[PDB]
Amino acid sequence: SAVKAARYGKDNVRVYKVHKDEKTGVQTVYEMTVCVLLEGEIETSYTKADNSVIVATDSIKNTIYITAKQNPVTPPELFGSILGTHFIEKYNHIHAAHVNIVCHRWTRMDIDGKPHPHSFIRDSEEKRNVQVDVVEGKGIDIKSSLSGLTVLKSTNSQFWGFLRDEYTTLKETWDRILSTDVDATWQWKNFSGLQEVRSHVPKFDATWATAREVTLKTFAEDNSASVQATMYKMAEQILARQQLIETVEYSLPNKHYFEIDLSWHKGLQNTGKNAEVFAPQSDPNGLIKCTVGRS
Amino acid sequence: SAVKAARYGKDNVRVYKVHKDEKTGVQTVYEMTVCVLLEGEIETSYTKADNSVIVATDSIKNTIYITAKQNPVTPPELFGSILGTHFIEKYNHIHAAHVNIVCHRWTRMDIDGKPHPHSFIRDSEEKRNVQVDVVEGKGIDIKSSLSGLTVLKSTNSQFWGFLRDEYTTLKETWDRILSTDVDATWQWKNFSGLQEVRSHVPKFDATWATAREVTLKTFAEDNSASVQATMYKMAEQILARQQLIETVEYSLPNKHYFEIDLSWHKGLQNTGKNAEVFAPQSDPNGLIKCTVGRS
Amino acid sequence: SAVKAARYGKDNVRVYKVHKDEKTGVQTVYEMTVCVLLEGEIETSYTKADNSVIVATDSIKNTIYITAKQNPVTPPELFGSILGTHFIEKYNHIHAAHVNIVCHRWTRMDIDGKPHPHSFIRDSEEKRNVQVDVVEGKGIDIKSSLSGLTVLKSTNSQFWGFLRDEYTTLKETWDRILSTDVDATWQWKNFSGLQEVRSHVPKFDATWATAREVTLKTFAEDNSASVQATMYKMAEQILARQQLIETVEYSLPNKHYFEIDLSWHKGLQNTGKNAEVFAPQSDPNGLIKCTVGRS
Amino acid sequence: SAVKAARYGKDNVRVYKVHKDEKTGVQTVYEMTVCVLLEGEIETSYTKADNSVIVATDSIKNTIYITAKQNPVTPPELFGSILGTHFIEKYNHIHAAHVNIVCHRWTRMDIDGKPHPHSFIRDSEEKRNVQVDVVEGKGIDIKSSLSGLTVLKSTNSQFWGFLRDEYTTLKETWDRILSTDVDATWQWKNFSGLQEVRSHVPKFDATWATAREVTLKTFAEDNSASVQATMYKMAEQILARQQLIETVEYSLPNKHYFEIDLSWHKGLQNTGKNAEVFAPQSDPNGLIKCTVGRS
Numbered sequence A, B, C, D: 001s002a003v004k005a006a007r008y009g010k011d012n013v014r015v016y017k018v019h020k021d022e023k024t025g026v027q028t029v030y031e032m033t034v035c036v037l038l039e040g041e042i043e044t045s046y047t048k049a050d051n052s053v054i055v056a057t058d059s060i061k062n063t064i065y066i067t068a069k070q071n072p073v074t075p076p077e078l079f080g081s082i083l084g085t086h087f088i089e090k091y092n093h094i095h096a097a098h099v100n101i102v103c104h105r106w107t108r109m110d111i112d113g114k115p116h117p118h119s120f121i122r123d124s125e126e127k128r129n130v131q132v133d134v135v136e137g138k139g140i141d142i143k144s145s146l147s148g149l150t151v152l153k154s155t156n157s158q159f160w161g162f163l164r165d166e167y168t169t170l171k172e173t174w175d176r177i178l179s180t181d182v183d184a185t186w187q188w189k190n191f192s193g194l195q196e197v198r199s200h201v202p203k204f205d206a207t208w209a210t211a212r213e214v215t216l217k218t219f220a221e222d223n224s225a226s227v228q229a230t231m232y233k234m235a236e237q238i239l240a241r242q243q244l245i246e247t248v249e250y251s252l253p254n255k256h257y258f259e260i261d262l263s264w265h266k267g268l269q270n271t272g273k274n275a276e277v278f279a280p281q282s283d284p285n286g287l288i289k290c291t292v293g294r295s
């Protein structure tokens, strides 16, 4: 037997950083969860109990804190690239670093219509994420994403004209609830290294903001023919607005809300046009995915 | 042996309701999770296998949907009171109903600066809750609450002057991070029945809004001497603003963020005045509670 | 306004302890999660920012580790009583300690039919818990429990003869699946103090074992007329076997498994006597509680 | 823009099946969670709102229940292969089916030393899983796995001789706790179709059992030089025992238990040879992976 693939490192490293503006007194906080996994010439730690090739995962953890101390942590695409580059440059025998970062929301509070200088609220479990793969001699591959964005529209969703056979019971509908948790990933063109990532820094926040805005607007305004059709419209628009993106991937659950027939009880009408009370279903759920790229 | 206490019913009943304004086309959604437990002359179902006294939990579930169809579901204090009253009035041998309601946020989306007529976002896992106890001959006891409101301030929190003995290692501090998840409960004076609850209907939303606003403002503005001192200030203000509240209870975790000493690494300064990078601690956590009532 | 009630302390303190037998080489591990909340003359920390009355929650955490170092941690009833007593005796102004302990399973592995000396497996998320309230001048109140014991029987459960009215759709049944997660609590007679708790030490593990065995046997053997009837049989037997228990409380979800009618598809028979494939329901669930005491 | 990849289907489909032996009266239950995602000529549902190509996810759900009714559900490798084959054969334009199955434990209860005929216990959250990819013209690819197997050994784990540089604070150790949650996946050689999968049916349960046994024995008996070294030993043995496996992958968290220095308190000795009480760390954690194949 032989080692075909191996990676190891530290997961679930929680990091908080504060920036203090001395002029204005305004403080800004960042909180992330970081995972770093390394690859390289490390097979002998598995096969021969040779620990000499291991950069201890505890040291990886230290490195994350030190790197956050000495560098900006925003945008996360830049921080991840710095962190990944560090490992492949510092260690001769490490040839790839894989960095995943989940950014948690700390949104500045408004108190009496004014932005507070040092108080923050977690407005939703929506995350902004990055996956950065730094591979020696092959540059930096970055996938950026938003996840945990939960939305619902109460009308202007339809689903009819699907295949009907002996396995089908679903009725066609011209008016239903549509609710989902959005997972959207945009993959950047490969970057040659840290200098190139630095040169595009302003595009990272702007593209995140565009992806979010396009997702919300399209969801709200599309008279949706299906999850498939609506999500494709989202991805098409993101690609049109940022030339440095190669692909956009969406993964969307269809979180079902079922009509409840109450007619057994005194002829109460609660279906079709009269539907007011619905039963949200925890499971099962549709799951629809698509990756859209350029012609 | 004897039955000393018994209650039974249906938990985790998810309910969604939509209101459609025909004039404006505007839709408003409500989504809740409901639990109803009943008490009464039901001991024989336990001791004698006498099911004749059991209102099936499946029927309780049906009743929740039917009641939501025929009544407003907002404010939840009113809906819970209607639901609880139904059971004690309908069934001679049922003498108490305990209704818990968790309201989930569906906040109307703003698209291009305008409120969308039928699209909604889950902005945070913060909940608004009620517990309604309807007891035959003893009226209606309502506890209202907000929970899952997660906040952090990066300065203007202190903690010094605590007891120091041979079990103490904690250093006094004049500048720390304070972060918590707020659980706040206000208990209404007992209501004689549904007519009285209906007469106070406008106070329920207003008091929730006041409780939330007081919590946020006090947290942000208090130069906090301790969690204890800050939370007391919150509760005092809520009681001053709503005479129909008897008690206010807060339960607050102290979610710790630890300094990281980096001096071992090239004398890097990251403690005290130089602290920028911190390690959020998942556990353990302080837990501080208090119930404040009137003199 | 006035402080009506207050308690504070440290939650989620994870503790592991190992015992090493030098003679046999056998090691035994214990892992717990501990919460300690204190009450006493501490109102001024809330009302006057007087921290002098506060035993820091960080010190409480230290005390838990120190106490675990110097004392046995098993049975948890004894450990909790030692820990709670410590606080009320050490601190003049602290008059109550509330200690909750969750014990996690680390079951010794059998390798080739032999018990391994130092290797363990987490066989299920079932917990053994205690709640210990130590109140100065009023002794020690202990509630012991097991929770997270998940069981299912595929037949020998019935449910018929319940109340039928205009809210009822549930069909009577003479053969159904019954599945639940068992939460069972036995409350000990009040103990005068630590000496008395020590004198009953062997009863704690034995009664836990009896409670577990009675629960499992009764569940498996009862041709169940309802959850209510079966759980009462459990509680009755536990009270008969341990005179030092005053009350037994059970809280049992009814985790529903629904028949699936497949007759629409080529007349396939999958209901009643022909039911083979079922749909487990995540929610809603019945919830049935009862507290049984002595005549 | 163009669709580069697309798949859609139903996730989180809970299924329970009972087998009743009429001769012995013995019942056996199976409970699973199933996900089925399809690929094929379905791009037009995304790009042109052409639902005619969509097999509704609701129909996929129906198909899972119907297939479970008409076929054995064990071993899951066989059930998944039947289910995946169904979709590619039934629908001309569907060319790939991806089936994931999580099997939940329902272990027969022993009551008074005898196996009970119809009562079961969930002994741990350990799962047995399969991923089956059925691709038209390319056969059936099966990955089998166990996950959620949580173990700890209190000694006979070491970690020394790792790289030490200016980022290292970790002390070398010759005696530590090792605890992990095991995720192990074995990938079968490609099968030409359902006939071939059927011909190997007895190997599926046997290989699962072997993988489990090897994992437990090696963990318990290895005087571990590192997680890396121990896991490699596991994978090597599994490959030696089943020639039809091509690769074995392990993914293992290193769940840390930290010594607690208590010397500040009356010189109490709780480190090194005197370490008895430890602090389990919820995060961060090491994460170590490896894929082992044949020379």
Ligand SMILES: O=c1[nH]c(=O)c2nn[nH]c2[nH]1
Residues within 6 Å of the ligand: A008, A054, A055, A056, A057, A058, D159, D170, D225, D226, D227, D228, D254, D286
């Ligand atoms: O077994 C281990 N492997 C590792 O790679 C490591 N890094 N720190 N501690 C460790 N333990």
Ligand SMILES: O=c1[nH]c(=O)c2nn[nH]c2[nH]1
Residues within 6 Å of the ligand: B008, B054, B055, B056, B057, B058, C159, C170, C225, C226, C227, C228, C254, C286
């Ligand atoms: O055992 C049961 N008890 C109940 O109270 C009930 N209500 N519906 N089904 C039920 N089953």
Ligand SMILES: O=c1[nH]c(=O)c2nn[nH]c2[nH]1
Residues within 6 Å of the ligand: B159, B170, B225, B226, B227, B228, B254, B286, C008, C054, C055, C056, C057, C058
């Ligand atoms: O605000 C606080 N209150 C407390 O009681 C405490 N104990 N340690 N740190 C603390 N902070």
Ligand SMILES: O=c1[nH]c(=O)c2nn[nH]c2[nH]1
Residues within 6 Å of the ligand: A159, A170, A225, A226, A227, A228, A254, A286, D008, D054, D055, D056, D057, D058
């Ligand atoms: O939008 C939808 N897409 C689908 O593929 C589907 N299948 N059932 N309902 C559905 N809704």
Ligand code: NA
Residues within 6 Å of the ligand: A087, A088, A089, A090, A091, A092, A093, A094, A095, A136
């Ligand atoms: Na390198």
Ligand code: NA
Residues within 6 Å of the ligand: B087, B088, B089, B090, B091, B092, B093, B094, B095, B136
């Ligand atoms: Na009544």
Ligand code: NA
Residues within 6 Å of the ligand: C087, C088, C089, C090, C091, C092, C093, C094, C095, C136
């Ligand atoms: Na005292």
Ligand code: NA
Residues within 6 Å of the ligand: D087, D088, D089, D090, D091, D092, D093, D094, D095, D136
């Ligand atoms: Na096909």
Ligand SMILES: [Xe]
Residues within 6 Å of the ligand: A180, A219, A227, A230, A231, A252
């Ligand atoms: Xe969508």
Ligand SMILES: [Xe]
Residues within 6 Å of the ligand: B180, B219, B227, B230, B231, B252
């Ligand atoms: Xe606070």
Ligand SMILES: [Xe]
Residues within 6 Å of the ligand: C180, C219, C227, C230, C231, C252
């Ligand atoms: Xe039961």
Ligand SMILES: [Xe]
Residues within 6 Å of the ligand: D180, D219, D227, D230, D231, D252
């Ligand atoms: Xe391991």
